[PDB]
Structures are given as structure tokens and as C-alpha cells.
Amino acid sequence: IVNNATNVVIKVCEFQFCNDPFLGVYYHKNNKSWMESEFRVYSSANNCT
Ligand SMILES: *[C@@H]1O[C@H](CO)[C@@H](O[C@@H]2O[C@H](CO)[C@@H](O)[C@H](O)[C@H]2NC(C)=O)[C@H](O)[C@H]1NC(C)=O
Ligand SMILES: *[C@@H]1O[C@H](CO)[C@@H](O[C@@H]2O[C@H](CO)[C@@H](O)[C@H](O)[C@H]2NC(C)=O)[C@H](O)[C@H]1NC(C)=O
Ligand SMILES: *[C@@H]1O[C@H](CO)[C@@H](O)[C@H](O)[C@H]1NC(C)=O
């Protein structure tokens, strides 16, 4: 279950998970905006219904 700042996603797949999975939000100084930029959770996704 991940909330990637735009839509709630529920997936049950054979993920090859990273040892340090995370999400990365980048703050842009010039326009003072925060954007979702990094999605480091799974290296692969297969075999799921
Ligand atoms: C959050 O995750 C969802 C699902 O993984 C993303 O929605 C998909 O985005 C891709 C990229 O354009 C589309 O091809 C798919 O059709 C989308 N699925 C839908 C609409 O059901 C969503 O883009 C992700 N959000 C961010 C900011 O990365
Ligand atoms: C995961 O995906 C693999 C890749 O297709 C599947 O491996 C084969 O699946 C077929 C379909 O039943 C079997 O006949 C083969 O014996 C499987 N192994 C090989 C080496 O071909 C695997 O079944 C999938 N697992 C799940 C739970 O969906
Ligand atoms: C802020 O600037 C960056 C880079 O110029 C851009 O990617 C981002 O979309 C901008 N944010 C807004 C809210 O316009």
C-alpha cells in the first residue's frame, strides 16, 4: 500500500524490494514548490492478480 501523493495504490505483486525503499519529494527554491520525484520501492513487478 503506497500513497504516492496523487493516488492511493494497492498492489500485491512479486516485488523485488530494495533494502531501503522510500519516496523522495524535491523542494524547488526558486518557485517554492514541493514535488514528488523519487519512487524507490521495487526493482521488478510480476506474477500478480
Ligand atoms: C502513482 O501511482 C499510480 C499507479 O502506479 C500512477 O498512475 C499511473 O501512472 C502512469 C504513468 O503515466 C499511467 O500510465 C497509468 O495509466 C496510471 N494509472 C492509473 C491512472 O490508474 C501515478 O502516475 C503515480 N503518481 C506519480 C506522481 O508518480
Ligand atoms: C511466476 O512467473 C513464472 C514465469 O512465468 C512462472 O513460472 C512458470 O509458470 C508456468 C505456468 O504455470 C509453469 O508451468 C512453470 O513450471 C513455471 N516455471 C518455469 C521455470 O517455467 C510461475 O508459475 C509464476 N508463479 C506464480 C505464482 O504466478
Ligand atoms: C517549479 O520549478 C521546477 C523547475 O523549474 C518545475 O519542475 C516545477 O514544476 C515548478 N513548480 C511549479 C508549481 O510551477
Contact (Cβ atoms closer than 8 angstroms) between residue 39 and residue 13: no
Q: Which three cell numbers stand for residue 12?
A: 500485491
Instruction: Say how many Å lie between the CA of residue 33 and the centre of ligand 3.
Output: 7
Percentages helix, strand, coil for the chain (3-state, rounded to 5) are 0, 55, 45
**Which residue numbers in the chain precede an interruption (C–N > 2.5 Å)?**
none
- Resolution as reported, in Å: 3.4
Q: Which three cell numbers stand for residue 7?
A: 493516488
Q: Which three cell numbers stand for residue 1?
A: 500500500
| CB of 40 sitting under 6 A from ligand 3 | no
3-class secondary structure, 41:
strand
Q: Which three cell numbers stand for residue 16?
A: 523485488
Approach to solving: cryo-EM
Q: Measuring from each residue's beta carbon to the nearest atom of ligand 2, which residues come in under 6 Å?
A: 46-47
Between the CA of residue 4 and those of 13, 19, 25, 37, 43, what are the distances in Å?
A: 17, 19, 10, 10, 16
